[PDB]
């Protein structure tokens, strides 16, 4: 009966942005004040709804999307953005009604050699639809020779790792993101 | 991909009105406000107002209040700015611009957006002039247009309205050394421009040079042979 | 291997002229073609990519055409700073292969060289060698004849020349000729002269000095 | 609303940091943290560089930065480059619920070389004289930086009437050009012995002269 | 700024080894394949090697296969090229180039390269000698001054004037290989003759192969 936000905000591991995790929140009491009365979040932006009025509203569905990206990509998690994350990994719709929450996770998600656990899609022929997920790992044929499932020249694997390292600059450091969607009335 | 495509160049008398359109595509039209910003040639940016297509609400700058009407057609994803009682100082490029979506921060304060996409602009020219074809005059080469083995030649395209005038040389066969200058607006309220071509001094006795002047608004096609002077 | 056949191997043209360079592939490569510009001493710089696309920041006088086997690169109106060697490059297959490619020079008006002569330094003489050098400065065209004379004796086989790359602004060249002698041979003679013949000079120009005169 | 005050122009050498100021009032720049900075290259729409005082949209270099003290907002451009040569405008929300742009600042990047203007002066054509007019035409080309001043003289006396000069426009070779016209009657043209077009550029002045007793 | 910086080039005996580096800043290195292209002195461009983002897909040209070894370290923003059993014809400037692969612009940024010289001849630093003007009282306009940089191996040498303050009128000529197997070069500058009493002219010669740095003041000869 107490809605499971601690499971979402404090999972030991977060998903890769290309394989972003969706957790449905339904049929329980949620105290959203624990989020908005925290000062440990580096981004807290709500579109079409104010976070202070959330405890007072009734929603049919609530979804909590969660993933890791890097610092200078956090601006792509918003309606009407373009870029690698917005176009190929996680696309928010223009009419998004919800909250985007992010914080620096450099202590958790960096390793000294480089964390190769967290991945992103590098390229896609066409842009993702809003809230679409593409987890395919098809070799991309950039030339006229068929790739035949193997990486080669003009034959490219569509993902790469962030390689997070503690000594990276804040732009390249890992940031954990939670996107709360609200389906109204 | 977000695209804002505006309607074409307008020419209007004072006291008339103009209605500029801005056709949006590649996004949910009702999710973003549109603003209009104008710029007189050579001058600063001036904010005119905004329309919010979701509820059709508007907000104009005071100096346009009563004179401007911003509307929207959701069926065609088009915003319109209509400016009435046009004046000479309304001559400007008018841009539609989209405002990125605003947000509420953690303590509930509203942060508005910024301009993330723009239309190509729409020139509105307000003048009391009516359409008029140019007269074309030769700018002949002399000893005083020659230096270092090259001579300068031209055509003066005088007293036309409105813009534009295009100039080629020798029916397109001459392109090197051609420089058609921007139009001057004279105190008469009509445009003049000149087209100069720098050629080999040696060719003046042997190559015929003809400027081809086209002014579409008046259906004016003029060919002018630019003959050399015997000045030394 | 895809062979890329570029043409011409060199081109000279006036400021404001249109210049064209062609490239032919030995098989169909669609639009998998780049044109690079390499200014002297610098890396190749991408100008036209995917056969016809202008790269960000590249001036609009540059453009490319073609698909499959025949490709064209064009400068609308040549400018002084377009001095470079240009290359086509295919990326349809490995190995990645290039045209050979094209040295572009600018044809300008004739400029006679300014001529200067330099005696050996005393510093160098201590070491048993004398280098005496002639500078021809800022001339066009590149063709120039330098003749060394020692007490009017025409010299041969004891000199070497070097020519700078064409200047990006004034489109001129400069040349340096070094006459190398032993100290002993240098001190036998008096009058050291550099004679220059060039189209800008109505007759040949000579610059000289006398050994041990100020 | 009160138009926000910016310097007409600033300049810096490549690699250095410049700063453009925007000073409004307690009802706009001082009233809110909704200050934006827009770049504009010639013939193109404005481009957002900074919003909400100091944030950057995706795709804008960290070289662009914004701050605010009291009623003055500052745009600072570090590691200055040639492509930064543009107009820059501040933009603020106002207590009237309207938005207002500043007057704008022209940024120039130093360290590209000075060209004097080539000047051609054409006298009136005989064909224009036979149409009862006389236009002197002064064509000005291949100068940098792109700012000339034009004065005309009849004989050696200044002429102010009948002069119209265009704004400097950038040529395709990334140098500048401009034109100036003196419109006279045939009577006026024949009256003086010589006419001059004097293009003063960066201190020095290139001159051309024409005389009614030529051909 | 997007930068690729090649390093590790120098003189090496036939059959010897060199490790070249390619270091990236100002972009996400890990999003680009890296390609090597070489240019022999006076010649065109020849592809040498390819290494993918992963560092697992690798190719070499027929010229260098079995002798060169390309590798990657994305944590250091670097690709390396180990060259063994080097031959005379490996002498070249070696360029590093990023390639996105998926779409154009393809191979869009290259570094300025690093020079590899394969030769059995030994390193020798240059002697630097003044090229000194005549004496001009009429201050007849232009005077020419210079430095002769003689008897060095291998290429290259750099010359600036007054620590890079003086650039107008400078010409630094291509080196010539003399019959001794050593290079010689002159760098000259045209200046106003009226400046010769008052302004100081110093050429700054750097031959990194021999770690010789000479500053030579060039003054008109004394009488
Ligand atoms: C997990 O997150 C909730 C969110 O407010 C917080 O109350 C709790 O302290 C967190 N647990 C941990 C990891 O200490």
Residue numbers in the entry:
A (entry chain A): 334 to 518
B (entry chain H): 1 to 232
C (entry chain D): 1 to 214
D (entry chain L): 1 to 215
E (entry chain B): 1 to 223
Task: Give the exact sentences the study uses for this entry.
The structure of the ternary complex demonstrates that 2 Fabs can simultaneously bind to distinct epitopes on the RBD, which is consistent with the result of the epitope binning assay that showed that these were noncompeting antibodies. It should be noted that residues L94 and I96 of CDRL3 and F486 of the RBD form a hydrophobic core that contributes to antigen binding. Furthermore, CDRH3 also interacts with the RBD via another hydrophobic interaction between F100 and F102 of CDRH3 and L455 and F456 of the RBD. Secondly, polymeric IgG enhanced antibody avidity by eliminating P5-22’s only hotspot, residue F486 in the RBD, thereby potently blocking cell entry by mutant viruses. Specifically, residues I28 and Y32 of CDRH1 form 3 hydrogen bonds with G413 and D427 of the RBD. Interestingly, in addition to forming a salt bridge (between Y103 of CDRH3 and K378 of RBD), CDRH3 interacts with the planar backbone conformation of the RBD via 8 hydrogen bonds. Finally, we found that polymeric IgG, rather than bispecific IgG, offers more potent neutralization against mutant viruses by enhancing avidity.
